[PDB]
């Protein structure tokens, strides 16, 4: 879990206007930045002898 307080914020709300739907989130002052990079991939392999 988190070893520190992650709810406190310093001053003017820093917007996090991104995501799948239309909703506005907040970024705490403890975190420098929180991007919403929705990457996705997979892998496969086959071995025979």
Nearer to another protein, 11 or 40 (CB): 40
* Positions 10 through 39 that interact with another protein (CB under 8 A): 20, 37-39
Is position 4 an interface residue for another protein (rule: CB under 8 A)? no
Report the C-alpha gap between 2 and 24 in whole angstroms. Answer: 23
Buried b (16+ CB within 10 A) or exposed e, 20-41: eeeeeeeeeeeeeeeeeeeeee
The answer to whether residue 45 forms part of the interface with another protein (CB under 8 A) is yes
- Which residues of this protein are in contact with another protein, per CB under 8 A? 20, 37-49
């Amino acid at each position: 879990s988190t070893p520190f307080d992650n709810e406190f914020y310093n001053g003017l709300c820093n917007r996090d206007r991104d995501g799948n739907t239309l909703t506005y989130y907040r970024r705490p002052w403890n975190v420098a930045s929180l991007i919403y990079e929705t990457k996705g991939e997979k892998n496969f392999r086959t071995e025979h002898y």
